[PDB]
Amino acid sequence: DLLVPKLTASVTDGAVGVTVDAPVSVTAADGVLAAVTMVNDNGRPVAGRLSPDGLRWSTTEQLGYNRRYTLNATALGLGGAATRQLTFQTSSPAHLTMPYVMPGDGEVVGVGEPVAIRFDENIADRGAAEKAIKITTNPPVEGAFYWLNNREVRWRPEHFWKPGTAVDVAVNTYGVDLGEGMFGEDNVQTHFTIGDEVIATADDNTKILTVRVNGEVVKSMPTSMGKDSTPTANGIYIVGSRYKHIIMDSSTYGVPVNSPNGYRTDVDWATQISYSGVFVHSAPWSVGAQGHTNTSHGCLNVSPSNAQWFYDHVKRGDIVEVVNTVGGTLPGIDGLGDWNIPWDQWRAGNAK
């Protein structure tokens, strides 16, 4: 006839390994919730909120790893009253890993910019990490994950972004088992926008670096690329950081300075385009060979004014394409060579 109220929680009494990637909630049937408290092992209460109709209570703040929580709830209805007490334990990680996402929040980047999520620890379960990363695009475009190394995963579409696209990255790793008892230390979120299409093409046959903005040629720079014994790899490069001046140190990229292809020299107006250490930069010493002969260690050498032009007008995520050199092809897992991996292979990924 008149039923007693019933209490249902999203955890159960005695549960262990409860993941903290989601709130805890309680629902009343045949009655309303009169009070709900949740405390940790130390008696400290957890913040929560009861819905206005009295039917549903939920935690509202982050739940902690390695905690024993006690939930007390009372429901009242015309049929009488019901009270329950539940204790559960949350996940106890063996390790925590912190994600770091690029590009930065609010940035405007070029059409070649991948989403990058780098953890500070090796990820045993790549599939769990990919599943925990939510990418929103507008206009919507399909994309896919691919791992550069054990710690950094990249996401991009099949073709270069459409200018004007919003990209939203929710790395929702808090409470997620990323393998072997390694859980996400925190969530991170970033949002960025794709700007103009900027593609600069260096053609060894002509020795010209041509900059096209939304398809229109805006600059033609005589360049000197890698001499035969240190060639510039062909392929697609993503623009990385830019520097007013920087000491280029070959040992940074694996080559002892004191070795025959080593070097250590202060350089102006330098835009990095590969982790292997290719840059567009000012080369006053080879102005005469630019547009004619390859003389560099791999860099795209241009005039000082053209290098400053490049610094001022080309942004992170814009594209440099190198063609017809005697080099090989830039490795797809360079760090900035993601677009050299064919789409079918990128889309199949490497989560295992």
Ligand X SMILES: *[C@@H](O)[C@H]([C@@H](C)O)[C@H]1C[C@H](S[C@@H]2CCN(C(C)=N)C2)C(C(=O)O)N1
Question: Active-site positions?
Answer: 281, 299
Q: Which amino acid is at 323?
A: V
**Do residues 316 and 103 touch, judged by C-beta distance below 8 A?**
yes
Which of 263, 308, 313, 349 lies at the binding interface for ligand X (CB under 6 A)? 263
Q: Which stretch binds ligand X (CB under 6 A): 25-33, 51-59, 105-113, 277-285?
A: 277-285
Burial 212-225 (b: 16+ CB within 10 A, else e): ebeeeeebebbbbb
Give whichever of 123 and 299 is closer to ligand X, judged by the CB atom: 299
> Amino acid letter at 147?
W
Nearer CB in complex with ligand X: 25/301: 301
- 240 lies in the site for ligand X, by CB under 6 A: no
Residue from 195, 277, 317, 327 in contact with ligand X (CB under 6 A): 277
Q: How far apart are CA 238 and CA 247, in angstroms?
A: 21
Q: How many Cα atoms within 13 Å fall on the side-chain side of residue 108?
A: 8
Q: Which of 92, 229, 265, 293 binds ligand X (CB under 6 A)?
A: 265
Alpha-carbon distance of 319 to 316, in angstroms, equals 9
As a whole number of Å, the end-to-end CA separation of the chain is 57
- Shortest distance, position 296 Cβ to ligand X, whole Å: 4
Residue 99, preceding peptide bond in cis (omega within 30° of 0): no
- Cα 47 to Cα 24, 39, 117, 259: the distances in Å are 11, 9, 31, 62
| Mask for 280-319, x = binds ligand X (CB under 6 A) | ---x-x----------xxxx-x------------------
Judged by beta carbon, residue 57 or residue 310, the one nearer ligand X is 310
> Contacting ligand X (CB under 6 A), which of 160, 279, 309, 310?
279
Q: Quote the least distance from Cβ 110 to ligand X, whole Å.
A: 21
Which residues are at the interface with ligand X (CB under 6 A)?
Answer: 248, 263, 265, 277-279, 283, 285, 296-299, 301
